[PDB]
């Protein structure tokens, strides 16, 4: 996969992104 | 809780790291097996050639 | 363990993950400060 | 703020890692097929010698 075409991989990356962006926006409050 | 927050973040990253390793390990598993079976064929051929020449000698 | 090429035994892979983590940890300390 | 940019950076890294790994597996597979083909040759001869 050249841009990453694997749905399992992208799912793992998106979840991490989602979880981290939430923790950070819970640390600034 | 800047220290409690950092621990949570790191546990989460530690998860992700083990998870991405499993993902890559499984992605290339068939190549790792191909190498193993063919490397087995080379052993078998090497256990026939070395037996004939020795016998031949 | 059957192969020395395998990702689980690959120090390049570990380096890349370790670096992501190191960066994220440094980055997030900056965002809080 | 967000970490999107870090992850986008990590995705390119992971793609370069995978390509690299594909190469490493490819060469090793070809190297062993060659060293495999040339074993059937020596066997093909040592059998045809005795005919
Ligand atoms: Cl890339
Ligand atoms: Cl890069
Ligand atoms: Na948002
Ligand atoms: Na660690
Ligand atoms: Na990184
Ligand atoms: Na961009």
Residue numbers in the entry:
A (entry chain A): 123 to 151
B (entry chain B): 155 to 211
C (entry chain C): 119 to 151
D (entry chain D): 161 to 211
Paper's wording?
Vps34, the primordial phosphatidylinositol 3-kinase (PtdIns3K) that phosphorylates the 3-OH of phosphatidylinositol to form phosphatidylinositol 3-phosphate (PtdIns3P), is conserved in all eukaryotes, and it is important both for endocytic traffic to lysosomes and vacuoles and for autophagy. The minimal Vps34 complex is a heterodimer of Vps34 with Vps15, a putative protein kinase. This Vps34-Vps15 complex is the core for 2 larger, heterotetrameric assemblies known as complexes I and II. In addition to the Vps34-Vps15 core, complex I includes an accessory pair of proteins, Vps30/Atg6 (BECN1 in mammals) and Atg14 (ATG14 in mammals).
The domain organization of Atg38 and NRBF2 sheds some light on how these proteins might function. Both Atg38 and NRBF2 have an N-terminal microtubule-interacting and targeting (MIT) domain and a C-terminal region of unknown structure. We obtained crystals using full-length Atg38 S. cerevisiae protein that had been subjected to limited proteolysis with subtilisin. The structure was solved by multiwavelength anomalous dispersion (MAD) using selenomethionine-derivatized protein and was refined to 2.2 Å resolution. The structure showed that the crystallized region corresponds to residues 119 to 211 in the Atg38 C-terminal domain. The asymmetric unit has 3 copies of an Atg38 homodimer. The ordered parts of the monomers are entirely helical, with a short N-terminal helix A (residues 129 to 150) folded back over a part of a longer helix B (residues 164 to 211). Each homodimer is strikingly asymmetric with the long helix B in one monomer almost straight, while helix B in the other monomer is bent at residue F182 at an angle of approximately 40°. The parallel arrangement of the 2 molecules in a dimer gives rise to a 4-helix bundle at the N-terminal end of the dimer and a long, parallel coiled-coil at the C-terminal end, imparting on the dimer the overall look of a mushroom. We will refer to the segment of the homodimer corresponding to the 4-helix bundle as the cap and the protruding coiled-coil as the stalk and the disordered residues 212 to 226 as the C-terminal tail. Overall, there are 2 homodimerization interfaces in the C-terminal region, one in the cap segment and the other in the stalk segment, both of which we found are important for efficient homodimerization in vivo (see below). The structure of the C-terminal region from Atg38 clearly shows the role of this domain in forming a parallel homodimer.
